Structures are given as structure tokens and as C-alpha cells.
Design a protein around this ligand. Structure first.
Ligand SMILES: Brc1cccc2ncccc12
Ligand SMILES: Brc1cccc2ncccc12
Lengths: 545, 545
């Protein structure tokens, strides 16, 4: 009975195989068949290639030895190599052209999701080329999806020597019969088979996967589109910045490149961006996913004034100062979306680009009190219920699991009405004691929000809604201004509070505004439609930021 | 009696003044004298420039209004503007050409060091230009050296209106008589003077500084070269990564750009790089200053094996994996320098470039036990004293303040002999009970190391020296390899343990090796010669990494 799946890198998890390049070069340069491939394996287990794969020497040390072997091979079959022939050039292009075989990775992901131990076993080299980062990036993207990465050059062993196979089984802590081993090389498959492992010769991916699903009893082909990679909180780099004596800001950080600051809404967490963090980091960005003031591991002072937009923005500017960041792209959702428009209006020099999910930019009305404005729209009734200190705190803090289960629902799910909340006497008055689990969240993810909210509760989060007059007065100072830096407004079709039509006049204040629209998407944009959020943000980031 | 110094940005802390550009443009384009300057101040306190300085509108909104005023001014003095005339172009160049007036900043730094409250008071704009980052960077570098930054566009007030002066005094919490105010504009100085503040009209910096020192009684001109900017631990972004169930790694992070991983030696801290962190971040790098395993806020497991080079390196690779960094430049000193050569030899794909201070790269001798090798050199006797678990821990942990005061000394100071430490029966046996304070460290900085070492003590740190056999066996696997990635070896003339001559054969294994040499420098390179360390590292980073 199987419980472990092992995959080769070249020709299995990564395509095209860096092996089929010697053949391609021979054909392209009208060279004798197998000429370059012979020079590659010259001397068998004692030759340059075996020493390279065992980690005795590095790739840059192997390059001149492979070149020598290429000449000695051309000498025997009495032929001549083109004057411009370069092994480095051939390998640089081959490695660079080699990409992840996505359906193979999807299959490995699915097997691991069903309780399988997954491993990459590969004959590889110590890459010291000036262009080594390309493959380093590829190994990083691949490895985090597996339990083990066994590299020949790191272990000093090589396929097909049987010591690497016994090493593999020892790291797996499994008997060969419990192991599937996928390889594109027949000779490297053989020792795994003669040990009693289930084996698959990988030519085309589809056939290999049909064999893989027939042998495991798990559907791997024609499976629904998977969700993007999520975050395991304990596997993240956690950052902490003191923005003032009593205020510390917590953030999760992933990636390299331009700084992208993610600002969640109410009542959320850095974890609300779990599906965006790995995707945006993979797209070449330095992701800084915040626990906004009043949330999770960030400080939560009790005072209402501590949560007005002016202080929140100033604190975010200090956060940039302390991290040594002259700018960051600011991406917000809900209350975070509102902060992010105010960062752009008051601190444009600190904002590389501004993006908002669901939250529109609506200039303050200087001829009307904000309380009047909120009352003029039935959907903003929840904001009036949030005004009285302690009332919403008691209801929201009573049963944390019920709070998040009731709040975090997709549009098709029996969502709370944000209409007549004051009259009804609360948010969950017509809601069950034991809400069903939404398809957007697992029980474990709900328990993360529960644990996070146990520290400070809902006072600080609710205080974001308790500065309407203060924020209105501050916003009125910006009435003559326009947002002229790169900006993205993402609308969610089925958000019945932050409705897409509320964003219709934004071009009057943001003329160069770019847009995105997510159909069949509720209020919780990031978890409702993660794939499309990532697609819209990456595309906008690569074009404008 | 003075206790506060206020500085203007334009023409005072920053040069050349963005004002003298309108004059330069007029002269360069043979335009009537004061033509561009008239259009600039058109309408006085009701014109476009006042609205811009008050934050009513942004710089990009002001650009077309300034262009209109430029035409109306040319209309009156019956002249014509060159067909290619662009206000944006003129201002982009002016802002870009404007740099920090270093002697003015040095004076402000010196005043603040003597207990003065320092402030920047400036008439500025909300910069939303596509090239706004340049000035954002300049404001970041300037502001962190001051107690307050008062910007006209943020406060909605402007010089010379007297409300900004009363605002300034309120933020300073000081009576005008306790305030020096430096301005290059006579009109902006006037309200500060008529309030009773000490005032200085700034034309040339030298005269302004002579006036400033005569008035404060503090030497500001012809003063010795200052030390580089240091770190205040509580003002840093602190990062934490779990590299394995029982191991968490702590680091301080500053800057944006390529990742630079700083690896301290024994018995140190991330704080050993206090003078490098702000400098390297300012040079365009993302600084990650580690608390190495066994130190400060990083985990310190008791087992000796937890500190062998193989596990330390693997853990550093996991650190990169968890942060989402495909590469980092690795900069090490002492034990950190040794780790950094092993990162380059075993993980070249993860190392952008490798630099070591004092620690040479010497390939392992496979024909001699490492214990024999250490014994063959009298200077490595301290390593033999460090072998017996508990012996060095007891001596080093007895009086923490004495330990750091005895260890951290410059070459001219009465340093400990690393010779005959076993025979003598310890490191501090011929050392005083109350060592004098070295010129390299303050009492406060000593107390930081003291507090840091109170958590885990010297077991984990000393365990780095207790894996000689294990490290030798691992190093022997790399004997066929060469270091072919960018590498820097920095030698310290007066390090009597890690002597510069021990590095003489390094080109045999690192052929493209680049070098640096610090004269009159002891073992504690970073704090002994901070200015020259920064100069060597920045120059090497900008050229090779
Ligand atoms: Br809280 C909150 C704010 C905005 C929209 C919402 N939609 C559904 C449930 C809760 C919501
Ligand atoms: Br601990 C140590 C290691 C290496 C060199 C040293 N020099 C002076 C004082 C202590 C030292």
C-alpha cells in the first residue's frame, strides 16, 4: 500500500529535459548523432559528469572538462566543431528554457494533500555560473511543495548507484513497496524497481499521470483547477516594528523585489492575504502582509482616537521609515482599502502605486456630516451599530468561532444582512448558534482567526469605524487634490455593502485609474476568488508598479 | 540659553537650493531676469505656489498652473519662451541635482549629540511625480537624524505666516529664546526673529556654521570625522524565522534592494554590525543582520552537534527558503566569516557574492586531524581552552560586563593574549576585575551585549568551536571545488589571531578573489574601523554584487 511518491527533476518535474539539449544541439549544428551526448557521459562513473553530480567539483569547473571531452569525441568520429561552439552557452540556454511541468507538480500536490510523503530525488550539480539564480529560483518554487529534496551533489551519491536508493528510503522512513518512483531515465528507475518500489517510466506527462492515478487510486488527471498556494503561519518570517512607544506593528514577509504592503479589512488579519503572499512573492515582489493596528500580533490600544485615518497613515509612514523603505505599493481591502486611498492622497512620495479591493474612493462631502451620509444608505447600518463602545464588542466576542463562521461566507452562502442591524439588535440575531462551514474556509483557518482575536478582541478593530467626524475633517483638507500616481480599483460584483456602482465616479479624482472586476465575488475578495485576485494584481503590478 | 536648533531644507540642509534653478534657467535660456521667479510667486499667498506649499494641490496639479503663469509673465515683459520649455523637466533636474549639505547635517548631528532638540521646518509640496522616489529617499535619509520634521504641505501652514512659527514652538515645547533657526530666506527668518528666536541667514554654509557655533558654544566646524550612523535596537524592524521545530533565527532588517546577509562572529550579536546596517541600506541594499544560532533572540539549543558547519549552513539555506529569497550576499566576520566561505562552497546557487572580514579561507588538510592543526599554532590556544564543556562558560558567564569590556578592545588597548590560555587557566586570569572602557564602545553598548547574553549564555556560542572533527570531515568533501562566485577577503593588520598572512594562499582556491586591507585594525573590525569597513563593502557590493 502506497504512502510515498518520489519524482525526478529533469524530464519529470521540470521540462524540457536539460538532457534533450545535447541531442537538439547535434541536430541544429548538423553534428554526428550522439556526439555531444557521448562527451557528456565520457568515462562513466569516473568521468567529469559523475564528479560533477557527486559534488566533487562545481558546474564552472566541469565546463572546460566537458569541452575537452567534446573534442576527443569529435576526434574519433573524424569531425569538426563549429568555431563558435560554447558548452556554457548551450547549458545557459537549456537551464533557462527549463520550466516547471505544472501538471506533474499539481499531481504531487494532490498526492501530498491526501497524506502522501513526497520527495524530489535528483542528479544535480553545484551551480556557480553567473546566471545560477534562475535555477536557484526554480528549486525554491519546487522544493516548498515537497517533504524532501535529495540532491546527488549534496549527498555525494548518484543515480543509478544503489546507496542513494537506500538513502531515499531511510529519509522517507518507508519500505520500498510503499513508494512510487517517477523517472524519465530507464537505467535510474531499474534499482528502485529491483528493490520492490512501484515505478513509472515518464515519457509524456499524461501517460505517466494515468499510470500514477491507476497505481495510487487518487484522481490526478482532469481534476478541478486547484486553489493558489496558501500560507502556513509558523513557516513565515514574522516582522515587528515599534512605530511609537506603545505601538508595535506585526507583518509577515515573503519575497524579493519592490515592496508590496498588504492592508487587510475588518475584522481580519495578515492571513486574509494567505493566497496572495506566495503568488505575489513568486511574481517578483517583496510582500509585507500587515496585521493592521488593533489586530493579531500588532498593538491594540483602547483609545478611539488611536484609530483615526490620520494617525494610522502616519504610523504606516513611520513603519516604512523604520524598515528603511522610501516607498511601497499599497494594496488594501475594506478598511485597508480606505487607508490605502488616504496614503496616496497625503503621502504620494511614499506610495509606489495604490490598489484597492472593493473599497471605492469617494471624496468627503464638506456640506454634510459623515453620520448623515452613512444614514442615507441602508447598507451602512452596520456602521451605526458599531458606534456605541462595548455593544458590538460583546456580540462579536461572545463566540469567536460563530463570529468568523457567520461573517466569512461566499455570495451563494446564507450571508448576514447588513441592513436593519440596529433595529434587529445585532449582526447575528437571525443567524444560527452553530453556523455551517463556508466553502471559502477550512475549520483550521477559522481557528487561526479565533486564536488571533483572543489577544485583543474587537475594541481596536471596531475603533476604525468610530472616527467618522475626525476622518471627514482630515479628508476635507485633500478636496483640491487628485490621485495621479498608478492606481487600481478592483470591484467585487456581489459585495452588497461595497457595491461596484459606488466606484463609478472615481475617474473624476483619479483620471489615469485602472480597473479590475470580479464576477460572482462577495465581500471577502481574497478568499472568495483567490486565483482572479492574484491574476489582476500581478498583471497590474508588472505593468504599473 | 539654547536647547533647540531648527533648519530649513532648501538652501540649508539641501544643496543646491531648488530656488536658484529659476534664476539658472533664465540665464541659460537668455530669458529676462526674474521672469521664471515672478511666475513662481504669482498671486502671492493666493497663487498656485501657496496652495501647493499648503497641501491644497499636488506638484503634478501645480505644474500646468506654473506653466500658465510663465506665459502671462512673458506676455507682460513682451518676450517668448523656447518651444521646448518644460517646467516638469526643469523641476525634475533641480530636485534630482539637490543633495544633502553634509557639513550642515554634521552640525545638526553634533548639536543633537550635546542634548539639543533638532527640527526640520520646510515649505514643501506633496510630490506625486513619476520620479518622486528620489526626494522620498532624500527625506528619509535626512529626517531620521532629527527629532521633528515639520512640512508646510502636511500642516497646511506656510513660512512666513506666523502660525507655523507658533506651531514649531509648540512641537519643540520651548520658548523662542531657547531656539536657533537657520534659513536661507530673509523673509522666512523675520517672524522667527521678531518672536525672539536666535536666527541665522544662511548664504554659504561655513559662515552659517561659524555663527551657529559662536551662538551655541559648541564646536561644529573643523571637528574630527564623525563615526558612521549606528543602530538604536528598539528603532529596528526585528524578524523571526523558524528554520526547524526547536530553532528560530532572529535578524534586524533595514533597506531595499539586493539582500545582504550579515553574519557576526564570537561572542557577538547582530549589533556588531550597528555601523554597517544604516550605511549598507543607504547604499541601496536590503540588510539582514543576523543573531547567529546560539545568540541573542535566536534559539540556543544545548547540543554540540547543533553547531557544526553543515547544520548551521543548512539552517541558513532554510532561512532564505522561508523568507522567499533565492539568493543573498553573505558577509561574515570571525565564525560568521567561516560559515560564509562554507555557504559559497556548498550552496553557490544561494550566494550572490561572499565577503569575509579577517577570517581566511584555508582548505582542510585531509592528512592531519584538526586538533593537531590548531595545536601547531600558539595563537589558536584559546580554541583548545574552549573545548571542555562548562570551563569557558563559567569564566565567560561569571561577570558579563567584565567579559565584553576585556574582549572588545582596539589594537592600542591592553588586549587579552590569545597565547597560553590553557596554561594560564583562562582568558581573563591576567586581566583586571574592572576593565577600562575601550574607545570603540560606550558603556550602553556593553550593556546591550550583557543583556543579550543573559538569555542563553556562552554554551551555544562556544559550541561553534566544538565541532572541529565534524567540520573537517564535511570540508574534505569540498577539496576538489573552487570558489568561482564574486568573493572579497578583508584583512585586519593588527588581528593577532586571524592574521592577514594566513590569507596569502587564497587565490589558489578563489582565483577571481578581490581584496581589502584595514591598517591599524584589531579583531573587532566593524567597530574598530567602521568608516573603512563601510567604504570597502559598499565599493565591492556596487562593483560585484
Ligand atoms: Br463586517 C462586513 C463588512 C462589509 C461587508 C460584509 N459583508 C458580509 C458580512 C460582513 C461584512
Ligand atoms: Br574571543 C577572540 C577571538 C579572536 C580574536 C580575539 N582577539 C582578542 C580578544 C578576543 C578574541
Amino acid at each position: 500500500t502506497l504512502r510515498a511518491a518520489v519524482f525526478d527533476l529533469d524530464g519529470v518535474l521540470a521540462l524540457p529535459a536539460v538532457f534533450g539539449v545535447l541531442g537538439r544541439t547535434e541536430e541544429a549544428l548538423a553534428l554526428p548523432r550522439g556526439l555531444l551526448n557521448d562527451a557528456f557521459q565520457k568515462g562513466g562513473p569516473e568521468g567529469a559528469t559523475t564528479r560533477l553530480m557527486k559534488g566533487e567539483i562545481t558546474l564552472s569547473q566541469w565546463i572546460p572538462l566537458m569541452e575537452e571531452n567534446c573534442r576527443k569525441c569529435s576526434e574519433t568520429a573524424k569531425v569538426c566543431l563549429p568555431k563558435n561552439f560554447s558548452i556554457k552557452e548551450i547549458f545557459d540556454k537549456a537551464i533557462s528554457a527549463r520550466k516547471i511541468n505544472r501538471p506533474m507538480l499539481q499531481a504531487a500536490l494532490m498526492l501530498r494533500k491526501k497524506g502522501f510523503t513526497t520527495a524530489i530525488l535528483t542528479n544535480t550539480w553545484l551551480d556557480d555560473r553567473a546566471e545560477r539564480d534562475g535555477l536557484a529560483q526554480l528549486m525554491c518554487e519546487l522544493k516548498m511543495h515537497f517533504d524532501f529534496l535529495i540532491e546527488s551533489c549534496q549527498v555525494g551519491m548518484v543515480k543509478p548507484e544503489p546507496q542513494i536508493y537506500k538513502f531515499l528510503l531511510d529519509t522517507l522512513k518507508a519500505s520500498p513497496s510503499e513508494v512510487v518512483f517517477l523517472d524519465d531515465i530507464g537505467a535510474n528507475l531499474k534499482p528502485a524497481r529491483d528493490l520492490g518500489m512501484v515505478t513509472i517510466l515518464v515519457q509524456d506527462t499524461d501517460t505517466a499521470l494515468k499510470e500514477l492515478e491507476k497505481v495510487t487510486g487518487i484522481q490526478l488527471l482532469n481534476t478541478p483547477a486547484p486553489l493558489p498556494t496558501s500560507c502556513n503561519p509558523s513557516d513565515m518570517s514574522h516582522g515587528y516594528v515599534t512605530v511609537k512607544p506603545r505601538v508595535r506593528l506585526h507583518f509577515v514577509e515573503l519575497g524579493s523585489g519592490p515592496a508590496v504592503c498588504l492592508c487587510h479589512g475588518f475584522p481580519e488579519s495578515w492571513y486574509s492575504w494567505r493566497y496572495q503572499i506566495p503568488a505575489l512573492a513568486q511574481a517578483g515582489y517583496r510582500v509585507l502582509a500587515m496585521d493592521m493596528k488593533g489586530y493579531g500580533e500588532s498593538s491594540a490600544p483602547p483609545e478611539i482616537e488611536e484609530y483615526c485615518m490620520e494617525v494610522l497613515c502616519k504610523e504606516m509612514v513611520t513603519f516604512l521609515d523604520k524598515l528603511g523603505l522610501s516607498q511601497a505599493v499599497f494594496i488594501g481591502h475594506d478598511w485597508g482599502g480606505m487607508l490605502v486611498w488616504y496614503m496616496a492622497l497625503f503621502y504620494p512620495e511614499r506610495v509606489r502605486a495604490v490598489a484597492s479591493l472593493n473599497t471605492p474612493f469617494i471624496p468627503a462631502n464638506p456640506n454634510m456630516s459623515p453620520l448623515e451620509s452613512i444614514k442615507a444608505n441602508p447598507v451602512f447600518d452596520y456602521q451605526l451599530y458599531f458606534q456605541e463602545p462595548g455593544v458590538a464588542e460583546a456580540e462579536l466576542e461572545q463566540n469567536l468561532s460563530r463570529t468568523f463562521k457567520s461573517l466569512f461566507r461566499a455570495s451563494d452562502e446564507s450571508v448576514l444582512s447588513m441592513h436593519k442591524v440596529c433595529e434587529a439588535g445585532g449582526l447575528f440575531v437571525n443567524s444560527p448558534e452553530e453556523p455551517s462551514l463556508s466553502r471559502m474556509v477550512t475549520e483550521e483557518e477559522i481557528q487561526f482567526y479565533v486564536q488571533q482575536f483572543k489577544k485583543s478582541g474587537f475594541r481596536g478593530p471596531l475603533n476604525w469605524y468610530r472616527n467618522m467626524e475626525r476622518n471627514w475633517k482630515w479628508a476635507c483638507k485633500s478636496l483640491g487634490r487628485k490621485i495621479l500616481i498608478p492606481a487600481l480599483m478592483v470591484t467585487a460584483e456581489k459585495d452588497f455593502v461595497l457595491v461596484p456602482q459606488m466606484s463609478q465616479h472615481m475617474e473624476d479624482w483619479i483620471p489615469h485609474l485602472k480597473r479590475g472586476h470580479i464576477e460572482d465575488c462577495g465581500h471577502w475578495t481574497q478568499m472568495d476568488k483567490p486565483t482572479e485576485v492574484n491574476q489582476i494584481l500581478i498583471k497590474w503590478l508588472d505593468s504599473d508598479a
